[PDB]
Every structure is written in structure tokens, then in C-alpha cells.
């Protein structure tokens, strides 16, 4: 039977208490939704592979024992837990396999300790572990509902003990205990952990209240990687895919220079005893298989050097030495081995780097009468040098006396050879040794090996190795005409490109195997959890063949792009708004095309439409919108300070002392934050404090039906914010500070305190609406709303006429307008952008920071006084001086940042300082500056960090044709219009201004008289009254 | 071309015909590499026969 795993296989990753943190680990779990074995026990009258998971249900505590080892037969070690009434046991011990076990021999550790384990069933989770000899066994006791079959549901296992385990493990049994046997079956869950890496949710209690498996699918790993357990709709790119290497080629040139050492194993006569030939061989190619292959022996003993060594070892300076001697003498010319001919004829150094290779030579060197030419000589004046001969036939005194002359009495320099006869000698027959030794200890290399080959291999990814030249890739046909000199070809990058055979020269290109990015296109997390893949700059013919989740590799939805392919979505022909860019002009969402579903489409730039345009017609406006827009402008971001000392050292005086070296760059870095921190001060100065004085606006708020009681401060709220400002305030999100605090990373409070800033904004917004734009010039000069209302109509070429005609309408539209403003404010949070993303940028950086103090920088660890504590003063600042150049690394990257920042922030800020210049203190005529339409006014409103204007704008509406001409004739003259245009409705023409249609007899007055009608192109025939 | 670089002994060549107008006449070729040996011996002086 089999099941699936749901959320079970979780434990406390170490023993640390730990409160409302997402923490992430790489430790070995049973993976979610894994293939969980459903075993059943029944009598009738397993492989522990990186640790095992088991989970118990049966009621009477019937399954009771484990067993843990390789071969569980007493020939090795085993591990044994057994539990009764009261208590628990563990041996560690050969049990032959008390019923459980025969006989206990070797035994050397067993454990005894407190018990363990104490219609609804309970599950008595257990984690067996094994790491380093090290096993940790977790457990939890859950009691739950009846059946359930592994229900839907989340625990840890707290850790009870560890063991010193140190024998090879490789497969586990349950063993179980009962009441003539009774007739019964139980049931039990088998898992399997593997090397995964998790998220860990902890409650305020610290216990792990869910889990998320990265490794699983793309939506957990897009919520590992952003370390939440939400994430928003979106494209996020995750870690990036890489199609593996098949297998390993090698390439090299053919068999040539071969060593003749074959000769010298063949040499009829080999080199005398005491006169011994040597001989050194280089610049060929040996082996060591081949050499006991076609020349067979069975005595050789070989010091220092592996048989298998000598093949893949290469020779320059190899000393050889063959000769013939007595089978009890072969083995004695070993170092420190004493004997006659050892000390007298022949001996190796002690540091012998060699080895040495015996056969029987009785039938080739013996006579019947014996081989009386291999002579020797047992007598020397000490125990010769290794490696000398001696030839001088001067005469050996072996006796007492000075024997001199030809001979003496058992005195003479040579010795007379051994009866060496074949069948005579019985290990005193003759043998023929060979002495290879390789004390090289010099550069050149000469013997090495034929350096095999393997196949070659083509149109796939392979580890290609060409004469030492290492990569990985597809091989292709070349076009390129290498030269006979030349061997591999590189490009501009300095990459090898293309390589030649050295086995056949024939040449292939190289190109390693094809990658791109992998971005995880998601909705809400709240609104679904399907998600779609996309495959950057891959051809997705390749990713399907490629099938750590490969689930999707093999999907029915692949669509192919510039950008890529994608998978998990549907490609669609019709055209909407772009919600998630994909790239190339594709982009997804999640519709119902009733089931809902992700898909991607060629992107829509909006509405297709073809202007009415003519020779002489002309669409004239006849009603307008009063559209009050927001424009939100980061202004100044929180003014940071830091204390090198602080951060860099753990208040450690030693660390002082040797950060006292780098003054110049930590005096460098304050300035430059102090710079920025005044430049912040300065940014809000500059846009905000533009008034030599605090205007107030007057008890009765009578400004021709314009309410402007939603941006005019309350007295009611402590804090003389507005309505609209309060909201504002309320909608950006300004513990983790007190760590940066205590890490010396502060926020020092902007110089104008909220309060001041409303009092600024206050003061802009009683100057605007009763004196208008005279107080940005010089002194503030009161004027009624609807009169400067009418100047700012009569800025964007409409007659003041329109606006005190439509003065309740035009009121009206400006009330809504604002209704509209608070209800947006209200309802969603994504109005201020902008401001909440500056705050999460310096909350960003500031926790970059806090956790780049975690990283070692190629130290002993992350913390100073254990460095402190473990290391005496040398070693210990060796380390420090490496640990302080990381963390000023880190500082100045801070730093540069904050500096790039805070100049985009001073942009902003100047953008701010001339829109509160050029809209609020006055009338822009800029286009889409203070708005989009004619702008005619526009009203700042404080907020976290930033300032928002009011934009209000005329924006035409309800437009209609006309025929239109570029000038009159009346009376054989050109007539044009003073400043407006001509119309016809269809039988009279009129002159109207030209953003409101109000059309006006054609008079003298409104039109201007120019040369005469025979040279205007498109000129019409009318009257005009006097 | 001779040249020794870590007790290795480079030589370069190339062959071409002229005219012979004069010594060195006005020109460009690279001389492609023939032959290498892994000398490693001390050179100082040299001499053509
Ligand atoms: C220019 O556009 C104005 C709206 O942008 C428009 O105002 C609209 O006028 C109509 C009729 O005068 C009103 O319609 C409603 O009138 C009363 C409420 O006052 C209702 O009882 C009726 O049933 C009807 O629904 C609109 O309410 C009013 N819109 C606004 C925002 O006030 C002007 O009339 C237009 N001017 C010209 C010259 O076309
Ligand atoms: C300017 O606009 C203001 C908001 O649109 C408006 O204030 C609003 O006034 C109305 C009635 O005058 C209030 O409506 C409520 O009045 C009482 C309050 O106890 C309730 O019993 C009623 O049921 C009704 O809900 C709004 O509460 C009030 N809104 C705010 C935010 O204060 C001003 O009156 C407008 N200016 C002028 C001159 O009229
Ligand atoms: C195009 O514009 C024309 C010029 O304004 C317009 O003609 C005008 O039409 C109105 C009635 O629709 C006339 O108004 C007079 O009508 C009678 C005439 O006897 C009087 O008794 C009334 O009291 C009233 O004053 C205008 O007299 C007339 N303009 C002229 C100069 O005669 C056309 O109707 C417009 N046509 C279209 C299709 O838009
Ligand atoms: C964290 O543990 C505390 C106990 O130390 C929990 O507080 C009690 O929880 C029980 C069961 O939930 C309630 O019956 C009590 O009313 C709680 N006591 C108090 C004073 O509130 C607390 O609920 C736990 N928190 C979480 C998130 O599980
Ligand atoms: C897969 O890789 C590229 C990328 O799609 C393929 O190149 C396209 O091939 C199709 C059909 O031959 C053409 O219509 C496109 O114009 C090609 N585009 C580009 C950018 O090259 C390529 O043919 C596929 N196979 C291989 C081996 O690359
Ligand atoms: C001005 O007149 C033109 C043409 O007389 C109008 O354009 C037509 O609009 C209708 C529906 O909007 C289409 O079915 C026609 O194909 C259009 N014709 C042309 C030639 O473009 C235009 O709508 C009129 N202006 C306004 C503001 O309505
Ligand atoms: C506007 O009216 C004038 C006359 O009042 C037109 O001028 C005449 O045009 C015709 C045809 O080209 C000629 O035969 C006459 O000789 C012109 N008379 C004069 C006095 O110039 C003129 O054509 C009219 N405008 C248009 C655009 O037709
Ligand atoms: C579990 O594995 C067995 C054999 O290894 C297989 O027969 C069974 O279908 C698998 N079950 C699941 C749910 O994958
Ligand atoms: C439990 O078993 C241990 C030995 O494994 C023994 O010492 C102990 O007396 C047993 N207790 C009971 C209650 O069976
Ligand atoms: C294991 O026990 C056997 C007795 O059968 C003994 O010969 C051997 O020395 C023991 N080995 C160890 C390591 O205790
Ligand atoms: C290597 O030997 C093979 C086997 O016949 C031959 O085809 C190939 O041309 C040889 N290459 C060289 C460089 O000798
Ligand atoms: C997700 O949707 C739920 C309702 O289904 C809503 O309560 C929640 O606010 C949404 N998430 C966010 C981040 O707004
Ligand atoms: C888009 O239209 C073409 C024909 O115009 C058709 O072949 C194709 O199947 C359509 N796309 C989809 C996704 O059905
Ligand atoms: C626009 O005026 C020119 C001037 O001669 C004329 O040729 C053209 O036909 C006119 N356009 C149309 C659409 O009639």
C-alpha cells in the first residue's frame, strides 16, 4: 500500500528558542506531498537511507522495538531499542538474530533511561537521524480523531537524544511484541528523508506553526525566496535552471614512443652481481598491466607504491637495475636488511622510492654443470654506498694477517660463482631481479602513460577533454580553417570556440549547454495558487527532453516567445491591458476565458481610433471636467547615522584599536551620511519652507461654494493635519529597529517635525486660496476664490466669462472631485507607491546591512568575542583586521547606495521645490507638468516623507464637428480671427475661442484685416457687420 | 627563431622566395612554430658554424 505524506516529517531544526521570524534551512525532511509507505502487520498461524520518518497510530501500544545497522546478523554492530511497562532500553551491540536475539558477543555500549513513549488513536511521530556517527532520534505524542489516514495537520518533534554511533548503517526493522499466538493486524507509516531546504514559521510561543517546501513547486519556491508566506501578483525570477552534462569524452592523439623495456626483461645475460650495469630510460610511454601480462612472475613485493600507482605516475630520472641472484638472495637487498652481499656487493638507500619485480631464471641461465660465471664479492673494506660498483682487483685481507700478492690463506678478492644447476637448487636455483626506483625530484616530466581515450561523442553536452583543454558543452561541424600549428581556436572574449581531434583532425565547435532565466509568473497568493513558468532565451524544444520539479517540463500549455517560453499559461489572439509584463510584448493574467486560468497575450496599447480629420473640419469642446489628480513626490527619505565602532566592532577595544588604522574611511563615510542627512533637512527646506511667513486662512470658509474643508487643517486632532492628510498618514506603514539601533545603525528625527510641516503646508494652502500667486512673488495680496479661479481660466486661453456662467457646476465638480480623492485614499492601498517603496528601500538596505553582521568574510565565525575568547592576541587579529575589511566593504557599499539614492531623492526633491514654484505658487502653461489637461491650480498635502499635489486640471469634454476655414473675405481683403477661430454650424459662421464652444457674430472687432483673398489657400466667402 | 623560456627550447621558422633585390626587403610574415625540446640546460652564448 502507499499514501500520500501531507504536511508530517517536521522537526526543531537545533535546539534555539526563536519568536514571529520566518527562518529558512537546508536540513534533511520528508518532503511534502511524498510517496509515505502504508504498512501492515499480520502473522499467520527496510532500506535506512538518510535517516527514516515513522509514524504510529495502533491503540495498546502494539508496535514496541527498532532496529537499526548493515547486516543485523552479529557479524557487525547493531542498534536495538525495545520498550515494556516501565521503561526503555537500548543496546548498541552483535545480536544474533528473548525472542529478538540468540546471543550477544562484542557487546561494548547499552543505554538505559526514562520511557519514551507513554476510539481516538494518537500518533507517536518518531525522526530517526544519523550524520557524522551522530544519531538524533526526534519524537511528538499527538492524539487525534478516529481512521484519518495521516489527517490534514502541523507539529515539530522536539529532540530527546543523541548517540555516538560508529558502524555503517544501511537498513532498519520494526520489531513488535504480543500474547498459542492471538490473530491480529496493525498498521504504521514508512518515510523517507532526503536533503531539502525549508521554510519555518514561528508563533510568539516559538513553536513551528507551518512549514513551506522550496523545493516542491514554483509558487513555494517564489515564497522561499521571498521569505513570505504570501506572495503578491507579480513575475519573480528564481533560481536558474542549467541542463546537465551527459557523460565525460576524452580526447587525445594515438599510440606513439613506446618504452622497449620489453628487451631488457628479455636480455639473454643480465648485469654481473658485483658488477652491476645501471641503466636509465625517458621520454616513452610504460604500463604496468602489460608488463605481468605477456612477461608473467609470482615473486615481487613492491615498497611505497600502489601496483595500480606506477601506470598514472611520470618518470624523468628512473633508475633501473637488473642482475641474476639466488632465490633466498632475492629478498634480501630490501634497506636495513643486514647480509654479505648487501653489505659487500650490492644494497638500495633506505629512502627507496621504487620497487622491485622477480622471476625464475634456472632454464635460460643454468648449465648441468652449473653457471660458474656470475661472480660476486662477500668482502668489502665497510658496508659499500647505495648505488656503487667496484672493479679494482686489488687483494682482500679476510684474515688476521695482511694477505697480499696473488692469494692468501681463505683470502682473496673475487669469489667463485654458485653451482647454479635447475634442479640442484632449491631456491638456490638463479632468478632474475629487477629494481625500478623513481627518487625523481626534478621538472621535466618524461614517462607517464598512452593518456587513453575514450569515444567522441557529437550534438550533445558532454565534460570534452582535449590535451588538458577542460569544458562542458555540444560539439558541432566547424567552419573554421584552423592551420597545421594551430590545435583549439578562442573568440574576442578569450573562450575557447572550437577544438580540433588530435586523434583524427577533423575540428568541432564548441557551445556549453544551453540556460536562461526562470521567472515564476503568480497571481495573488490569496486570489489562487496555480502559477506559470517562463523559460528565458531557451528554444522550449530542449526543456521537455531536459525532464528539480520536472511535473510542468511536460505540460500541454508551451508558448514560445522572443523572451522565451512559457509554460502553465494559454496563448490567447484577443488584446487586453498588460497586467504582468513577460517581455517581447507579452503579458499574462488570470481570467476565465466558467474556470478561471492564467494565460499570456500579444499586449494591447490601447484603443485603435482614426481621427475625423478634412480639409476644413474642425471638433470644437462644448463642456469641460473640473479632474483634481494626485501627483505623489518622494521628498526627503529617513536620515540615517552610523558609528563605525559600533557596527564594525562588538564594543571591543582591540577591534577599536585596529579600526583606529582605517580613521580616514570611517571619517569619510560619516561625511558623506552626514552630507546626505543635511541634504534630506535641506530637500524639505527647500520645497516646503518656500514662505518668509505662516499665513492662517480666516474663520469663515466662504469661498464662493469651493469646500475645501478636506485639505484645510481640523482644530479637533491634536496634530492640525487635514482630513485628506490624515489619510495619507494612515496609508503608509512606517521588533527589527530596536536591533538596528542596537547594532549602531540610527534614525536621526527629520529638523521640521510633522506638526511644522502641516503648519508649512497650511500656510501654502491659506496664501493660495486667498491671495493666489501674488505671495509667491512678494507680499500676499488677498483676492476672492472665484476672481483668481477666473485668472486661472483666463491662463488656459478660456474667457473668465465661462467659469462665473458655470460657477455652482464648476464648484460642484471640484466637491466630487475631492469626494472621489478620499474615497480612492480610503479603498485601496496602492495610491501612495511611490512613498511606501522609498520607506522599503531604506528598511531594505538598513536590514541588508543588520545581516551581512551574520556573514564570516572568510573568518573563523561572525561573532568577535568568541573570536576573542578562543584565540590568543596574533591569530585572533589575523582574523579581526580580515572580519573589519569585510564589514567596511559592506559599509561603503551601504554607503554608495544611500548616495546614489539620495541623489535620485534630491532629483525628486528639485522636481518637487519647481512644481510647488510653478503650480501651486503660480500657473504652469508646461504641458502634463502640473497635470494632465490645462492645469489651473494645484493644492500640496504632507506625507510620510514626501508631499502630494492636487492637481486640478480643465479637461475638454462632449466635443463636436464644425466646418471650419483659415480666414474670410468680405470685401476682396483677408479677415482673421483676433483669437479664436471660424466655424459654420452649416449656414452662418462664427468666431468661437478654441477649448469652449460658444460661438459670436463676425465683427470687426474679433477679426483683423490682412492683404487680399487671391493668395490664402482654402479661404471662404461671408459678411461682417461694422 | 631560438628562443629558452623555463628550460624549454623553442624554434621558429618560415620560408619564403624573392627576388633578391636586397638584404631584407620591405615585407610582413610570422615564422609559425616547428619544433620544442624540454632542454632545461643553461644558455648564454651562442655560435653558427
Ligand atoms: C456639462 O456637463 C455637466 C456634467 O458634467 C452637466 O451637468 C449635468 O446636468 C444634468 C441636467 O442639467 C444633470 O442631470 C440630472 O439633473 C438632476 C440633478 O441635478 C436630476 O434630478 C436629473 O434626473 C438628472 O439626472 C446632471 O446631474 C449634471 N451633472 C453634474 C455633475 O452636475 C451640464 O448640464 C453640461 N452643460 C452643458 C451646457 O451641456
Ligand atoms: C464640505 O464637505 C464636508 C464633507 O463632505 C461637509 O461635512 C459633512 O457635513 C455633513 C452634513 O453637513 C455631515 O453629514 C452627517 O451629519 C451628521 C453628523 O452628526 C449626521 O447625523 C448625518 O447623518 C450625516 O451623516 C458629514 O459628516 C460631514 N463630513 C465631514 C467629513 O465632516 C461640509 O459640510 C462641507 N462644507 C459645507 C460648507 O457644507
Ligand atoms: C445655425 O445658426 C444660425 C444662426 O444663428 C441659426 O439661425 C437662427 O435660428 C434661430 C431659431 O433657431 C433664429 O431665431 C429667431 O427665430 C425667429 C425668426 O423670425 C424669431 O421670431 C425668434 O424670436 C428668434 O429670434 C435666428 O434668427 C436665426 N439666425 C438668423 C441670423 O436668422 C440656425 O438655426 C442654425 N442652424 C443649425 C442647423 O444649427
Ligand atoms: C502561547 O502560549 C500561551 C500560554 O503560555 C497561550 O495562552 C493561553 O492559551 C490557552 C490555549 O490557547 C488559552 O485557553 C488561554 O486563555 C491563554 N492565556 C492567556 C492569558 O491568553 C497562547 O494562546 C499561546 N499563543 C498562541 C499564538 O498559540
Ligand atoms: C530552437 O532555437 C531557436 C529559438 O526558437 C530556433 O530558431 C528559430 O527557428 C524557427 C524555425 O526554424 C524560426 O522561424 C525562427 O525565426 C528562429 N528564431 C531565431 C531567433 O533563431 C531554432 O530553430 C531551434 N533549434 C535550435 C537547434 O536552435
Ligand atoms: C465627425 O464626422 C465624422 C464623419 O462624418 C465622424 O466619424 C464617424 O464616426 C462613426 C461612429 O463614431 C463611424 O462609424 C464612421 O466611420 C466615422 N467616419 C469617419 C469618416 O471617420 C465623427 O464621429 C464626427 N465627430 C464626432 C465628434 O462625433
Ligand atoms: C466670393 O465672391 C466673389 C464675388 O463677390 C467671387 O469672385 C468671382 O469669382 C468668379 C468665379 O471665379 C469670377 O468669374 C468673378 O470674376 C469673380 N468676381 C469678382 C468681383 O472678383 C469669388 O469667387 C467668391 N469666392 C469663392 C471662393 O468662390
Ligand atoms: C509509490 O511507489 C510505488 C512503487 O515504488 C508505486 O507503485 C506507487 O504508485 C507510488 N505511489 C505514489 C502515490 O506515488
Ligand atoms: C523492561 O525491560 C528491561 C530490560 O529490557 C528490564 O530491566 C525491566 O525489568 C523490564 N520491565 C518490565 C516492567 O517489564
Ligand atoms: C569479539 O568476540 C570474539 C569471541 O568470539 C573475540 O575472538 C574477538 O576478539 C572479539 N573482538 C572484539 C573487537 O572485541
Ligand atoms: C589514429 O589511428 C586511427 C586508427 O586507424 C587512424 O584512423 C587515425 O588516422 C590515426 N591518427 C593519427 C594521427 O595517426
Ligand atoms: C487577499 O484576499 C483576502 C480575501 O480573500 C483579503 O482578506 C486580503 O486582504 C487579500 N490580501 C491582501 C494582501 O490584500
Ligand atoms: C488565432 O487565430 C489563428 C487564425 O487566425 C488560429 O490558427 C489560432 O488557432 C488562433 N489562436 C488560438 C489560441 O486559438
Ligand atoms: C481639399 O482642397 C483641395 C484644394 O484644391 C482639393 O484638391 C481637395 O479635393 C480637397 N479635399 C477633398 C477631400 O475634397
Known sequence: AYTNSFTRGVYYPDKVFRSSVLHSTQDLFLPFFSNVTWFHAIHVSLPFNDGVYFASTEKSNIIRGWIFGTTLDSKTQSLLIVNNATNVVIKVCEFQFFRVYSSANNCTFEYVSQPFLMNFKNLREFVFKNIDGYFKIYSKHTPINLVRDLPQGFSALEPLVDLPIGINITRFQTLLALHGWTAGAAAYYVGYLQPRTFLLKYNENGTITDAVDCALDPLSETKCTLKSFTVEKGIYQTSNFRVQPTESIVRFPNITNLCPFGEVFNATRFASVYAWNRKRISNCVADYSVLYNSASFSTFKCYGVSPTKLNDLCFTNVYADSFVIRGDEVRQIAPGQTGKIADYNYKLPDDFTGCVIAWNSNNLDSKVGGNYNYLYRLFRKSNLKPFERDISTEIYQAGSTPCNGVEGFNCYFPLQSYGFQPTNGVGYQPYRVVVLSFELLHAPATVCGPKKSTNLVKNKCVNFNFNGLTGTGVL????????????????????????????????????????????????????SNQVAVLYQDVNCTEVPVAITWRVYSTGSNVFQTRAGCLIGAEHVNNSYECDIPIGAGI??????????????????????????????????????????TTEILPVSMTKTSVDCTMYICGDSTECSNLLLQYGSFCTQLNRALTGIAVEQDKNTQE????????????????????????????????????????????????????????????????????????????????????????????????????????????????????????????????????????????????????????????????????????????????????????????????????????????????????????????????????????CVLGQSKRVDFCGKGYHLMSFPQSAPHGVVFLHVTYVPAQEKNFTTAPAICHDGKAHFPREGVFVSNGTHWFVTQRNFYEPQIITTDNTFVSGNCDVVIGIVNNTVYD
Open 587 to 628: 503579458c499574462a493574467s488570470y481570467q476565465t476565458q466558467a474556470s478561471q486560468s492564467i494565460i499570456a497575450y500579444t499586449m494591447s496599447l490601447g484603443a485603435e481610433n482614426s481621427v475625423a480629420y478634412s480639409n476644413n473640419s474642425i471638433a470644437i469642446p462644448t463642456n469641460f471636467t473640473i479632474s483634481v
Open 476 to 527: 558541432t561541424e566547424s567552419n573554421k580553417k584552423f592551420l597545421p600549428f594551430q590545435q583549439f581556436g578562442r573568440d574576442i572574449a578569450d573562450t575557447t570556440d572550437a577544438v580540433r581531434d588530435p586523434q583524427t583532425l577533423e575540428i568541432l565547435d564548441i557551445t556549453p549547454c544551453s540556460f536562461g532565466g526562470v521567472s515564476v509568473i503568480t497571481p495573488g497568493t490569496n486570489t
Open 687 to 918: 520645497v516646503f519652507a518656500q514662505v518668509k511667513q505662516i499665513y492662517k486662512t480666516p474663520p469663515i470658509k466662504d469661498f464662493g461654494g469651493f469646500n475645501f474643508s478636506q485639505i484645510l487643517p481640523d482644530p479637533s486632532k491634536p496634530s492640525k493635519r487635514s482630513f485628506i492628510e490624515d489619510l495619507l498618514f494612515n496609508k503608509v506603514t512606517l521588533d527589527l529597529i530596536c536591533a538596528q539601533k542596537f547594532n549602531g545603525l540610527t534614525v536621526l528625527p527629520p529638523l521640521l517635525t510633522d506638526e511644522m510641516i502641516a503648519q508649512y503646508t497650511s500656510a501654502l494652502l491659506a496664501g493660495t486660496i486667498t491671495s493666489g500667486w501674488t505671495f509667491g512673488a512678494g507680499a500676499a495680496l488677498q483676492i476672492p476664490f472665484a476672481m483668481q479661479m477666473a485668472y486661472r481660466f483666463n491662463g488656459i486661453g478660456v474667457t473668465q466669462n465661462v467659469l462665473y456662467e458655470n460657477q455652482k457646476l464648476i464648484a460642484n465638480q471640484f466637491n466630487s472631485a475631492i469626494g472621489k480623492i478620499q474615497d480612492s485614499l480610503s479603498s485601496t492601498a496602492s495610491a501612495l507607491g511611490k512613498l511606501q517603496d522609498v520607506v522599503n528601500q531604506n528598511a531594505q538596505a538598513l536590514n541588508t546591512l543588520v545581516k551581512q553582521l551574520s556573514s564570516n568574510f572568510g573568518a573563523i565565525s561572525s561573532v568577535l568575542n568568541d573570536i576573542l575568547s578562543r584565540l590568543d592576541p596574533p591569530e585572533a587579529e589575523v582574523q579581526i583586521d580580515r572580519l573589519i575589511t569585510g564589514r567596511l566593504q559592506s559599509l561603503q557599499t551601504y554607503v554608495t547606495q544611500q548616495l546614489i539614492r539620495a541623489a535620485e531623492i534630491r532629483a525628486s526633491a528639485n522636481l518637487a521645490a519647481t512644481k510647488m514654484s510653478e
